[PDB]
Amino acid sequence: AASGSALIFDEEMSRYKLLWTDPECEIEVPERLTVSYEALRTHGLAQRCKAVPVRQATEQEILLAHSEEYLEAVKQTPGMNVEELMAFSKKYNAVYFHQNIYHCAKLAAGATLQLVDSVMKREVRNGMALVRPPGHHSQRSAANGFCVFNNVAFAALYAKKNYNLNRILIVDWDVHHGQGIQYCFEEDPSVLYFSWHRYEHQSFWPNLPESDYSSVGKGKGSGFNINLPWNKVGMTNSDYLAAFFHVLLPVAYEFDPELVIVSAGFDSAIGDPEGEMCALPEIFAHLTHLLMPLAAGKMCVVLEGGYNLTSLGQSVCQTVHSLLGDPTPRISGLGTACDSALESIQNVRNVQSSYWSSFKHLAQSETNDVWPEPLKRMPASVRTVVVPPPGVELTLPKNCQHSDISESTAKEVQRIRDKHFHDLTDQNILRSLGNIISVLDRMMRSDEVCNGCVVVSDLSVSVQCALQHALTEPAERVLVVYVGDGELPVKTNDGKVFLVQICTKETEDKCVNRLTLCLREGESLTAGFMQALLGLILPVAYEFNPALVLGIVEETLMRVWGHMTCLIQGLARGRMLTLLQGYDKDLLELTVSALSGASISPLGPRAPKPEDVEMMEKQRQRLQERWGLLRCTVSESW
Ligand SMILES: [K+]
Ligand SMILES: [K+]
Ligand SMILES: [Zn+2]
């Protein structure tokens, strides 16, 4: 299977710039590229990437998305002097030309196609192209908003033509609307376009009525265009994640794309003079991470805008860190989206309810600037520790490792035994508790190991020992994810534990530190679980911000376990301990694979039970006043 991340860059794309006074254009400078690459170099990220070379897009490739007349006109700009280039520039909106920009536009496009080929040929898992000029405003017969040719539109059309793809997701998290991309695929249901963007009730450039939430596509393309307008500035991490959990991800996992292309503008980051948003560079590590289980990880990130040279380098670094699979930074201080964002989210969900099964219950009554430097991210020496039953030998990925109970550890198990399980002498259980403590010590008190999986026999003693040992070390907060019925030795009264329970018996919960999901038996179990995962489990988990995730599966319907294990590593810097009760080689293999950062198989493109949607929305109703990140409507005021 594929490994590594491509980084496609070339100094030549920094060799065009603005040559006359124009306040509308002066922010777009060559240094955006140099500062971004240099930041990757400084943090050792460029050196870990495969440096695929740039090429020129050919004429035929440019004509995938642009007209012969527009290509011919642009092809003449290398022969123009400055007066002539100014006159050519003024025929278009917010864009400038330079004798070398045609050369560079062909490289930006070629670089993007190189990234598509490297990913789709399995030569790398994923990658990023640092290109200039940007593309997403560019249109069939017009340059627009610093864009000459539409790099990301090329990539999707090229991936359709040469790899026969039926479903491509484009995610445009640049702060501007990518109207060139929307127009390109307006009637195309094979390319799903999502964009959030500063809009301010259409007063923000490019001032288009069709940038609003009601443009859902046209014809056979209805429902495959998703606009999320931001109608106030200052959007925060909580706004961006609310957008992902309640709009983008439900649609993306139902769409089930065969390739993800990110139109990655970082002018949506704090400090940018165009976006004026407040999301920290660390959020881009999670936006990347939440999309990586799609399309078996095949993700092509393409640079669009981003204009604060400092916020730019840090956001590029956070994205590449996640592409390489480094642990995600913890996001603190999350809560409800602001009211303006909730209005936008509510409105997009309602108009899209005609097209997507995640939102269909909305359609019926019965159903309805300075900021702190980001901390260092380092891949662990061994990412994943595995402890199968005694004597069982498994073939492990190159970044996993078995685990040799030390003497201090063994003294701890004895101390614990004499106090809390005086009668326990089963030397199998006592082995497992030595394994749990040893794994947790490597995960928490060392940068050596990131996560782990231990196969256990007795659930109660192992869960108690795992949870209690993590709380005292101390881990301020622990998220427990439990698939199974009954009660665990887990107290959820203080603010230190949150328990997600996936069970079979429809119970009642009254604690707002518990999320109990009773999913009805049937063929709809996968869609319902994915719906619960993105719209309930992830929002709460992210707001809780645990220091450790404790997964638990009882021995007594888990083709979703890999997706959860992968997504839930966005919490607690990836520090997850999974206890499997009893041996199941396939479940243990799947768990270790997802924990170790391996690609996860797609689910295939369907609809959940209305009883399940009702059960889930009752949970949202019961929890969202405490956990505001659950909210996907504006709250009623008194
Ligand atoms: K956008
Ligand atoms: K579309
Ligand atoms: Zn932008």
Domain positions in the chain: 1-367, 379-631
Rounded to whole angstroms, how far apart are CA atoms 355 and 103?
Answer: 41
Q: What is the number of residues in the chain?
A: 638
Closest ligand to residue 153's CA: 2
Rg from Cα positions in the chain: 25
Q: Distance of alpha carbon 35 from its chain centroid, rounded?
A: 24
Return the structure tokens found at 1.
């299977």
Rounded to whole angstroms, how far apart are CA atoms 447 and 442?
Answer: 8
Rounded to whole angstroms, how far apart are CA atoms 268 and 447?
Answer: 32
Tell me the helix, strand and coil percentages in the chain, rounded to 5.
40, 15, 45
Distance 396 CA to ligand 1 centre (A): 40
Say whether the peptide bond before residue 539 is cis (omega within 30 degrees of 0).
Answer: no
Closest ligand to residue 134's CA: 3
C-alpha distances in angstroms, 508 versus 495, 502, 516, 623?
20, 13, 8, 13
Distance 387 CA to ligand 3 centre (A): 48
Distance 342 CA to ligand 3 centre (A): 22
Distance 218 CA to ligand 2 centre (A): 8
Indicate the Cα dihedral angle 544, 545, 551, 557, nearest 10°.
70
Rounded to whole angstroms, how far apart are CA atoms 36 and 41?
Answer: 9
Distance 234 CA to ligand 1 centre (A): 16
Closest ligand to residue 189's CA: 2
Q: Identity (one letter) of the amino acid at 624?
A: Q
Distance 263 CA to ligand 1 centre (A): 8
- Paired strand residues for 129: 8, 302
- Paired strand residues for 479: 498, 549
Technique used: X-ray
Coil, helix or strand for 101? Answer: helix
Q: Distance of alpha carbon 31 from its chain centroid, rounded?
A: 27
Quick check: 621 and 534 in contact, CB under 8 A? no
User: What is the DSSP code (8-state) at residue 244?
Assistant: I
Q: What angle do CA 168, 171, 172 make, to 5 degrees?
A: 135
Resolution (A): 2.2
Closest ligand to residue 145's CA: 3
Distance 465 CA to ligand 2 centre (A): 51
User: What is the DSSP code (8-state) at residue 93?
Assistant: B
Indicate the Cα dihedral angle 382, 596, 407, 580, nearest 10°.
180
- Paired strand residues for 386: 402, 453
Distance 50 CA to ligand 3 centre (A): 27
Quick check: 527 and 608 in contact, CB under 8 A? yes
Q: Identity (one letter) of the amino acid at 615?
A: M
Q: Identity (one letter) of the amino acid at 35?
A: V
- So which residues are the catalytic ones? 137
HEC per residue, 429-466: HHHHHHHHHHHHHHHHCCCCEEEEEEEECCHHHHHHHH
C-alpha distances in angstroms, 235 versus 276, 282, 300, 534, 593?
8, 14, 25, 21, 36
